[model samples]
Target: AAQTNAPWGLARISSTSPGTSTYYYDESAGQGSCVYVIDTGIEASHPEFEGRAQMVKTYYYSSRDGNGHGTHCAGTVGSRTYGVAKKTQLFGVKVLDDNGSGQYSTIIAGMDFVASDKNNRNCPKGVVASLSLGGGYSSSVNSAAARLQSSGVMVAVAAGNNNADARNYSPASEPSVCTVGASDRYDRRSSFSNYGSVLDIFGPGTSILSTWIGGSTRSISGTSMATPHVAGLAAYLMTLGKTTAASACRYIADTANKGDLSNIPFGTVNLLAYNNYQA
Candidate 1:
């Protein structure tokens, strides 16, 4: 395929602003990786998926998405047009209900499912999970995330939208997962994005446009939007053999555009995400 146009978030990662709007990536981007979107659910038939996304498992009753969070997240992770890892096989893990709410145990159930999928021979390699949802501290959920990583599934989670320190959040504060904050195109910390040391990186969050339910598209804002960008990056890196969670996190941090984000809380890491792709 020829070079493709990029959404702002994708273009933001591959190259800095004032550059081309084309998203530059390896020809084999996400060729050997699969991503799990653990949220409301995904609209499996969206054209953006190009048949690469599916509804593999659902803890919820329906396989189809009612709320659009999962579909949007899946789009950001691997949609053909709006995604970062364009060739990735995305599996939607429906945990949140149609109203976009779920108990902490539901979160653990989703993680356990992914961990089990990692050992399932039927599943593909380079397993990555993107959790664009979170809440207050849940020890069980944190343990689930750590064990998910222990099973070799690269996990990326959103820091909350609370505008408070991320250290108080659950999976965001979990050491084993990649915790991401939100930033805008201006390279400034999003006012509502959680901050502090627990954050692994920041991604383009404000006014992010991606796939939605009903075969449509929408643009929204939150650390939720920021997360899948990092998750997609992790999915991409995994295809290149950065399979371990620690290594993916390290590579993301090491390669990020440091000192770019400003107005973040004092002592928070100022790392802005980048995919290290040159134009």
Candidate 2:
């Protein structure tokens, strides 16, 4: 096979902005590990995910497949990471279903499924979970997230995409989770990205070129994409023995690119400064 035109190549970060011929000289590559995406079911046929998805377990609690939300997330985190890590694997655990909503127990059950998957040979050895959906921060979800983290699963939760304070959003409020915010290539806080003290890091989420349901292509913007950026990065850093939840969180906080995201409490999360931090 020939190398891709993408300057970032297989690096997790997209070197070029969408629809432009521009490509950067830098790259961010995942180490080719596995991540479990817990969201609306994925489309399973998006071109970006071609030859990359490795379905370990899927459970549809409320909505069925064809839900567009999960498909978008899957594209962000696992879409081949392109040249970054072609062999990276994705496991879709459908806890939210298709309606973009589900009960807290549904999510708890899904985590339980992943946590107890040691007997399943298909389960990735060091798994990271991507969660982009949130209703309200619930104690149930928080407890479950802690358990998952203790079990060696790094949970990357979106800090909500509503561009509001994240004080009341569930799961994201879970302190143990690496709550992500959204930023653009220039490292500016997105107008639509939620902000809060709970935020751990920020990633590229605005107008992201990603996969959607039914094998379609479009630019969907949200913290949804940001969560995956960190998730894939966590998988990338896993190769350096930074597989623990705390290590993943530290890596993103340290290595993420630093800039003036100064419209917030912390002066903006260093976009890719996370890579600077180590286990």
Candidate 3:
């Protein structure tokens, strides 16, 4: 279950900041942000991420790195940048262990951890929850996603990376969550990305560079990468500093660029353009 070679290629390329090529701007003036990256595992100590990333919570739902997919997926979303939300913390839930596999129950447990108050000191009041891992959509988890939404935590889920036309994933298809699909650098549909009626918008999820294991920079890809793009965007939009999931989603959807709604759904958001819109 290794990720493809061009995950970001499957999503649009929002130029990394400190260069000012994209509409993205710097807002990391110590905003004290954090995200729960529920995935296989993240190399918490990579160089580009040395003093930039933090792990406040770690859980094991798998025993091994079946294919090292999760680690790469996490880096694409939250890897450090010059003035972006770099100081933000990352939490990991190893549901897909070494074998690159996991069960729905384990994934749900990770969500429970986010909803529970056991780690209040670490989770805090306005923490962001990022879920770059997902199998398919399920109506069963809809309520749970709503609970997290109502609790003021912003949750981002990946629309499956499958090339299939079906939208049968659990958390990603769940209505309560923000379902992100992949778009190419041209902001067009990625042939490998799963699309249908339930997808929310597109983000960078193709061949992307980020800090990898053994203190290195590697290029990895997936819809998993796309999810974090939204996660980071939500955190930044909260620069107005409201922590509710609804407001965050609304702020992003409302602010997202919608010039080309002809190709997209009638009301679905256009996050690629939203990245540069000033509040």
Best by lDDT: 1
- Candidate 3 residues 170-243, lDDT tens each? 67777767877765565555556666666776676666566555666666567776777777677655653543
**Once superposed on the true structure, which residue ranges of model 2 sit more than 4 Å away at CA?**
1-32, 54-64, 81-85, 122-125, 240-243, 266-279
**What lDDT does the true structure give each of the candidates?**
0.86, 0.66, 0.58
* Residue-level lDDT for 4 in candidate 2: 45
Give a tens-digit lDDT track for model 2, residues 1-279.
223454221222433222332222113334346777888776665567776664455555333356777776777666753223334577778887566777888888988887776336343435788888787768888888878887888888888877777768877888877888887645567778888777888777776766677777567778887887678667767754655555788766765555545455554354442443221
Which ranges in model 1 have alpha carbons more than 4 Å from their true place? 1-5, 18-20, 121-125
Worst 10 residues of 1 by lDDT: 117-126
What does candidate 2 score on TM? 0.81
Ordered from best to worst lDDT, the candidate numbers read 1, 2, 3
Please report how far candidate 2 places residue 270 from its true position, in Å. Answer: 4.3
For candidate 1, the per-residue lDDT at 139 reads 81
TM-scores, all models, native as reference: 0.95, 0.81, 0.79
Candidate order by decreasing TM-score:
1, 2, 3
Q: How do the residues 31-78 of candidate 1 rate in per-residue lDDT, one tens digit apiece?
A: 778888999999989988998888878877688999999999999999
Top candidate when judged by TM-score against the true structure: 1
